[PDB]
C-alpha cells in the first residue's frame, strides 16, 4: 500500500540503508503481517486446507501446522520475524493454538493501526488491550467446566479428536483417539514428590508406508528403530523375563590414550601386546555374557570382533542408536544406564541389577524396514505408534499431527478444567467486552471495543474455508451469546445457551458437549498474552532503521 517510496533528504544522513519514519512503518508492518497471516487463514479449522512448500531440491513438505509453515519461511522484514518466532514459541510451550495465535495477533495489528490514524495514542491503545485482557482472563475462569459424570476415558477421547481435526488424521480420528490416550497414560511417571508429569516425544513414531492408516498397530511397549549387527542373531526371543543390557560402551579394537607412546626393545613383546589390545575388551564382554543377558543395547558401533561371542551365546547385538532413546528403555525395563563401566572398588565387576526385565524382545519387519518391538515392560510401562500411509510425505504430516495431539492431551490431565472449542470462547469474549468499558468510557472505550471485535477473526475465518455463508453463522453466535450475559443464577433456562455454536460440518448451531469438541483451558490462556506482546512490540515502533551489511 506504499507508493512513490520516500524522498531521501541530504540534511539527514546515516550509514547504511535509508531511514523511513512516520505512518509508512506501521503501514509496512501490517502489510508484512497480512503476508504471513493470509498463509495460515486457509489452513485453520477442519474445513481448512494446508499448503505446500518446495525446498528447491525437488522435495516438498505438506503439513497443516502453522509453526512448520512459518518456520520454513525466512522473513527478511524485521517485524515479520516476531510472528514467525511466535509460532515456534506456541507449539513449544502449549503445543496447540499455533494457527490461532498468528491470526489473532494479525487482527490486533490491523485494527490498532487503524486506531493510530484515529489520533488515539498507541499507549492508550495498549492500555485498552491490557485492561480488556485482564477481565477476559477472569471470564475464562467463569466458563471453566470440570469433568464429572463421565464414563471411562471419553473425556480425553473427545478432547483428543479436536486436535486431530483439520489434519489428515481427522477422518481417522475415531480410531486414533484410543491410541493417543493410552500412549500418554503408559508413560505416566512421578516427580516433584507426588506431582504427575508426562515426557514429551517419549512415544516412538516409526514411519512405514503400506496397508492403510486405520490398521496402524499400537504396541504395548517401546519400539526402537535400529538394524541388527549380525544377521546370524535370532530376531525373536522366546520366554519371559528377558534381560536387556543398556550400555554406552562400544566393543571395538581401540587405540590406547594419545599420551602414550609404546617403545619396545625386544621383538618377543609384539605378540602379547597386540593380543592384549583385544583382550582388555574381552574382560568386559565376558562378565556380561555370563550373567545371561539376552539383549545387549549399545550406544556406539560394535566391531565384528566381539560379535562372534554373541552368536555362540545366542545374544542379540545392537549398534548405534539415539542416546535419548536408550534412557527410556532402561527405565521401563528396570535397567540402569551405564556411561562407563566401573565399581566403587578398584576391580571391575558386573551386577545383575543393571539388567532390565520384560516379557519378550522381538524384531518385526515393516515393509523393508526392520525394527525391534519390546512388549510387556516390568518396571514402567511404555508405548509406541507406527504410522502407516500411502507415501513418506503423508507420514511426515502424520508425525506432526500425532505430536500435536500428544500436547493437547498432556495439558488436559494437568488441569481438569476445560473450555468448549469451535469459536465458542471467541464469540463469548466478544459480548463480555462489549458491555465492558461502557462504565469507564472516555477515550479508552474505543480501543477496548476494537479488541472485542479483533477476536471475531477466528470464528469468521472458519466459515470462509467451508464455502458457506459466514454472516448467517456469525449473526447466530451474536444472538445466543448476547442475550444470556445478564442472566441471574436461578429460574434456569438462560445460560443453557451461549455455550455452543459454529459447527462447520453441518453449518448449524449444535451443542459442543454432545458433539465432543473441547479444548484445554491452558491452550486459551498464554495465547492472548503471547499475541499481546507481539502486538505491543510492533505497535510501539514508529521508525525502522536498516543498516547495510559490511
Amino acid at each position: 500500500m506504499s507508493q512513490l517510496f520516500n524522498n531521501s533528504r541530504s540534511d539527514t544522513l546515516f550509514l547504511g540503508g535509508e531511514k523511513i519514519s512516520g505512518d509508512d512503518i506501521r503501514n509496512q508492518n501490517v502489510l508484512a503481517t497480512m503476508a504471513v497471516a493470509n498463509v495460515v487463514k486457509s489452513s485453520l479449522g477442519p474445513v481448512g486446507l494446508d499448503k505446500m512448500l518446495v525446498d528447491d531440491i525437488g522435495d516438498f513438505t505438506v503439513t497443516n501446522d502453522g509453526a512448520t509453515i512459518l518456520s520454513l519461511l525466512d522473513v527478511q522484514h524485521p517485524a515479520g520475524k516476531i510472528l514467525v518466532e511466535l509460532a515456534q514459541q506456541q507449539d513449544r510451550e502449549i503445543g496447540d493454538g499455533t494457527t490461532s495465535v498468528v491470526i489473532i495477533a494479525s487482527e490486533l495489528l490491523k485494527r490498532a493501526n487503524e486506531l493510530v490514524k484515529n489520533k488515539i495514542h498507541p499507549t492508550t491503545i495498549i492500555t485498552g488491550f491490557r485492561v480488556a485482557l485482564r477481565e477476559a482472563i477472569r471470564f475464562i475462569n467463569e466458563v471453566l467446566s470440570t469433568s464429572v459424570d463421565t464414563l471411562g476415558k471419553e473425556t480425553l477421547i473427545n478432547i483428543a479428536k479436536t486436535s486431530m481435526s483439520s489434519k489428515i488424521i481427522g477422518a481417522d480420528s475415531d480410531f486414533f483417539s484410543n491410541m493417543v490416550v493410552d500412549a500418554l497414560l503408559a508413560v505416566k511417571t512421578q516427580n516433584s514428590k507426588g506431582e504427575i508429569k508426562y515426557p514429551v516425544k517419549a512415544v516412538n513414531v516409526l514411519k512405514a508406508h503400506g496397508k492403510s492408516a486405520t490398521e496402524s498397530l499400537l504396541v504395548p511397549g517401546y519400539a526402537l528403530n535400529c538394524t541388527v549387527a549380525s544377521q546370524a542373531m535370532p530376531k525373536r526371543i522366546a520366554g519371559g523375563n528377558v534381560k536387556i543390557a543398556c550400555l554406552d560402551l562400544n566393543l571395538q579394537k581401540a587405540r590406547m590414550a594419545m599420551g602414550v607412546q609404546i617403545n619396545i626393545d625386544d621383538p618377543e613383546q609384539l605378540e602379547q601386546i597386540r593380543k592384549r589390545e583385544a583382550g582388555i575388551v574381552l574382560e568386559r564382554v565376558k562378565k556380561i555374557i555370563d550373567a545371561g543377558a539376552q539383549v545387549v543395547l549399545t550406544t556406539k558401533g560394535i566391531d565384528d570382533l566381539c560379535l562372534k561371542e554373541f552368536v555362540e551365546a545366542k545374544i542379540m547385538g545392537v549398534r548405534r542408536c539415539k542416546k535419548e532413546d536408550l534412557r527410556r528403555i532402561a527405565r521401563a525395563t528396570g535397567a540402569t544406564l551405564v556411561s562407563s563401566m566401573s565399581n566403587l572398588e578398584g576391580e571391575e565387576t558386573f551386577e545383575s541389577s543393571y539388567l532390565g526385565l520384560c516379557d519378550e524382545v522381538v524384531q518385526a519387519k515393516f515393509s523393508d524396514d526392520e525394527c525391534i518391538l519390546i512388549k510387556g515392560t516390568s518396571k514402567h510401562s511404555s508405548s509406541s505408534i507406527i504410522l502407516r500411509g500411502a507415501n513418506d510425505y503423508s507420514l511426515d504430516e502424520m508425525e506432526r499431527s500425532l505430536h500435536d495431539s500428544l500436547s493437547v492431551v498432556k495439558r488436559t490431565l494437568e488441569s481438569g478444567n476445560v473450555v468448549p472449542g469451535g469459536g465458542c470462547v471467541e464469540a463469548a469474549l466478544n459480548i463480555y467486552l462489549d458491555n465492558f468499558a461502557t462504565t469507564v468510557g472516555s477515550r479508552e472505550q474505543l480501543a477496548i471495543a476494537e479488541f472485542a471485535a479483533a477476536l471475531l477473526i477466528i470464528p469468521k475465518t472458519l466459515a470462509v474455508n467451508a464455502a458457506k455463508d459466514s454472516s448467517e453463522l456469525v449473526a447466530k453466535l451474536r444472538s445466543y451469546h448476547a442475550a444470556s450475559q445478564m442472566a441471574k443464577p436461578e429460574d434456569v433456562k438462560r445460560r443453557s445457551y451461549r455455550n455452543y455454536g459454529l459447527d462447520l460440518i453441518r453449518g448449524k448451531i449444535v451443542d459442543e458437549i454432545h458433539a465432543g469438541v473441547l479444548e484445554p483451558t491452558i491452550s486459551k490462556v498464554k495465547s492472548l498474552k503471547s499475541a499481546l506482546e507481539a502486538c505491543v512490540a510492533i505497535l510501539r515502533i514508529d521508525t525502522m532503521i536498516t543498516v547495510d551489511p559490511e
Binding site: 503476508a35 486457509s42 489452513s43 477442519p46 481448512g48 486446507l49 494446508d50 499448503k51 512448500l53 518446495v54 525446498d55 528447491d56 531440491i57 525437488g58 516438498f60 505438506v62 497443516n64 519461511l73 525466512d74 522473513v75 527478511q76 522484514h77 489428515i168 481427522g170 477422518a171 481417522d172 508406508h209 503400506g210 496397508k211 492403510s212 549380525s230 546370524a232 579394537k253 587405540r255 602414550v260 607412546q261 609404546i262 617403545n263 619396545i264 626393545d265 621383538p267 618377543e268 609384539l270 601386546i273 597386540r274 589390545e277 565384528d304 570382533l305 562372534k308 552368536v311 555362540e312 515393509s367 500411509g389 500411502a390 507415501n391 513418506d392 510425505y393 503423508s394 504430516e397 464455502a467
Partner: protein, 520 residues
C-alpha cells in the same frame, strides 16, 4: 519485497486443477504398460545406461518429474514394491484415475474436499468387504496351484514364453527361503546374473556362486565333501591399533622382527589346521605367505569376500562366522557341502558350492540366469522379483482374489448399488469411486484393440447374474470367467491397490496453495 515468497502464487480452484492435471499425466505414460499386451518403455538415465521395462515402478523411478503434486505419485511406486512388489503399475493408474474421476467437482459443484474425503473413507471400508467376499481360498501345499499363480504376473511380461520354466525357478526359490509363520525375505535371494547362454539352461542352484578362482595352482578345484570355515580377520600381519615403534639396539633384533612376522602368521595357520578345513574363506585380503602353510594341510584360500556374501555362505553349509582364530572349534565348521567346482567362462571365473540338501535356520540359494545380453538379464531379474513376490502373499494370506480386472469391476458394481441407498450429500463422492474402479479393466480393452463400450456394458450385466469371477480376456478381448481362465492373483495385491490409491488421493485434495523455491 518480503521474505522468500510470491512470484506467481496459484490460488483458488486452479491450484487443485493443476494438481489433478499433473497427477493424471503420470498414469497416462504407463497407461499402455498395463495388460498382457502391454508395450515397453525405454528410459535414458544421466549416467549413460539404459532401462527398458514395462513395470511402472522402474519407469517412474528413473524419470525426473519436477512438480509438487506429481512427485507424490512417484512415491506410490515404492509403496507397492517394498510392501508387496506386484501391482505397482495398477496403483499408479488407479490413483491417477481416482483423483480425476472422484473429484471433477469443485470445478462445478464446489464441494469441499473434506466432505469428499469422508466419503472416500467409507468407500474404502466397503471396498475391502467386497474383495473378501469374491476371494476364494486356495491350498498353499499344492504345487500345481502355485505354478498357475506365479504365471499371473508372468503373463504381462516377456518371460511368458518361458513361464513353464519360470514357475520352476520361482517356486523352488521361495520354498527354500521359507522358514517355519513362514516368514521369508529376498535379502538372502541372490540376483547374480550370467551373461549369455540359454534361458532353458538356467536353473536355481543351492549355495553361493563366487566369481573368484582358487588362489594357488595346487588348490584342489574338485572336492567330494567340502568343509567351509569363515574368517573375518585377514591372514596378513596385523599392524595393531597403536604403533609398535621397536627400538633396535643390536643387529640381531631386527632379523627377529621379520622372523616373528613369518611365525606369527604361521601360528594363526596352525590353529586353523586343527579342524582341517578343506575350504577357507577370508573376508579381507590374504598374504602369499599364509597360503603355503594352509596348502600343506589341505586348506584352500580365496580372494577377499564382501560382507553380504559371508551371510549366505553360513546359511548353506551351516557354518558360523569365526573372527578369532584361537576360538575356532569343530562345532562352527560348515559341513554337508555337495560339490566344489570351478567352470571356465571368458569374462570371469565361477566357483560353485553345492548343498547336500539333507528344522533349523533357513537355507540360502542363488538363481543362475542365462540371457541373450546384459540388459535382458536385468529385465528377467525384475520379472523374477515380481513373480517370486506373488508366492509370498499366498503363504501369509491363503485368500485368493479374482484377477483379470474382476476385482476392480466387482467393487464398482457394489458401490453403484449402495450409492442410491446412501443418498445424502456424500452420494456423489461415493458413486464417483465406482467410475474410477472400472478404468483398470477398461485399459485391458484399449490395449487389446476391442470396443470398451460394448464389452464393459455386457461385463456389468453378466457380473450380477453370471458370477463374480467374470472378467476381461487379455489376448482375445472377450468376456470370460476367471474360473475357466485358470489365472488368479492374491488378495494382498488387490488390497494394497485400493488402500494406497485412496489414501494418496486424500492428500492431494487437501492442497490449498503452492509456493515453489522457498529455501533449502
Amino acid at each position: 519485497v518480503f521474505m522468500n515468497a510470491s512470484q506467481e502464487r496459484t490460488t483458488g480452484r486452479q491450484a487443485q486443477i493443476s494438481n489433478i492435471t499433473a497427477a493424471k499425466a503420470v498414469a497416462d505414460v504407463i497407461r499402455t504398460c498395463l495388460g498382457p499386451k502391454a508395450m515397453l518403455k525405454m528410459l535414458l538415465d544421466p549416467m549413460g545406461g539404459l532401462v527398458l521395462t514395462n513395470d511402472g515402478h522402474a519407469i517412474l523411478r528413473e524419470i525426473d518429474v519436477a512438480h509438487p503434486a506429481a512427485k507424490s505419485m512417484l512415491e506410490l511406486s515404492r509403496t507397492q514394491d517394498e510392501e508387496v512388489g506386484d501391482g505397482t503399475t495398477t496403483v499408479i493408474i488407479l490413483a491417477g484415475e481416482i483423483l480425476a474421476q472422484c473429484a471433477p467437482y469443485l470445478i462445478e459443484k464446489n464441494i469441499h474436499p473434506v466432505i469428499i474425503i469422508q466419503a472416500l473413507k467409507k468407500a474404502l471400508t466397503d471396498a475391502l468387504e467386497v474383495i473378501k467376499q469374491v476371494s476364494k481360498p486356495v491350498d498353499v501345499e499344492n504345487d500345481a496351484a502355485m505354478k498357475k499363480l506365479i504365471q499371473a504376473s508372468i503373463g504381462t511380461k516377456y518371460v511368458i514364453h518361458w513361464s513353464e520354466k519360470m514357475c520352476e525357478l520361482a517356486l523352488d526359490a521361495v520354498k527354500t527361503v521359507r522358514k517355519d509363520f513362514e516368514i521369508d525375505i529376498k535379502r538372502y535371494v541372490r540376483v547374480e546374473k550370467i551373461p549369455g547362454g540359454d534361458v532353458l539352461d538356467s536353473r536355481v542352484l543351492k549355495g553361493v556362486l563366487l566369481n573368484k578362482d582358487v588362489v594357488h595352482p595346487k588348490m584342489s578345484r574338485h572336492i567330494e565333501n567340502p568343509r567351509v570355515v569363515l574368517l573375518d580377520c585377514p591372514l596378513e600381519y596385523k599392524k595393531g591399533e597403536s604403533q609398535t615403534n621397536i627400538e633396535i639396539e643390536k643387529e640381531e633384533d631386527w632379523n627377529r622382527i621379520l622372523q616373528i612376522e613369518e611365525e606369527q602368521v604361521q601360528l594363526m595357520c596352525e590353529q586353523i589346521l586343527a579342524v582341517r578345513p578343506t575350504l577357507v574363506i577370508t573376508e579381507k585380503g590374504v598374504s602369499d605367505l599364509a597360503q603355503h602353510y594352509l596348502l600343506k594341510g589341505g586348506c584352500s584360500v580365496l580372494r577377499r569376500v564382501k560382507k553380504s556374501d559371508n551371510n549366505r555362505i553360513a546359511r548353506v553349509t551351516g557354518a558360523t562366522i569365526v573372527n578369532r582364530v584361537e576360538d575356532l572349534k569343530e562345532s562352527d565348521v560348515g559341513t554337508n557341502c555337495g560339490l566344489f567346482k570351478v567352470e571356465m567362462i571368458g569374462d570371469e571365473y565361477f566357483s560353485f558350492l553345492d548343498n547336500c540338501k539333507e528344522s533349523g535356520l533357513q537355507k540360502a540359494c542363488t538363481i543362475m540366469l542365462r540371457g541373450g545380453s546384459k540388459d535382458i538379464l536385468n529385465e528377467i531379474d525384475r520379472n523374477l522379483q515380481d513373480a517370486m513376490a506373488v508366492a509370498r502373499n499366498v503363504m501369509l494370506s491363503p485368500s485368493l482374489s479374482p484377477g483379470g480386472g474382476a476385482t476392480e469391476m466387482a467393487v464398482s458394481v457394489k458401490l453403484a448399488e449402495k450409492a442410491k441407498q446412501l443418498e445424502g450429500i456424500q452420494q456423489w463422492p461415493y458413486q464417483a469411486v465406482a467410475d474410477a474402479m472400472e478404468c483398470i479393466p477398461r485399459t485391458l480393452i484399449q490395449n487389446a484393440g476391442g470396443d470398451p463400450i460394448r464389452l464393459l456394458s455386457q461385463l456389468r450385466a453378466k457380473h450380477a447374474q453370471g458370477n463374480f469371477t467374470t472378467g476381461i480376456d487379455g489376448d482375445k478381448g472377450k468376456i470370460v470367467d476367471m474360473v475357466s481362465y485358470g489365472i488368479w492373483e492374491p488378495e494382498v495385491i488387490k488390497q494394497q491397490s485400493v488402500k494406497t490409491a485412496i489414501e494418496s488421493a486424500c492428500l492431494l485434495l487437501r492442497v490449498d496453495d503452492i509456493v515453489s523455491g522457498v529455501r533449502k
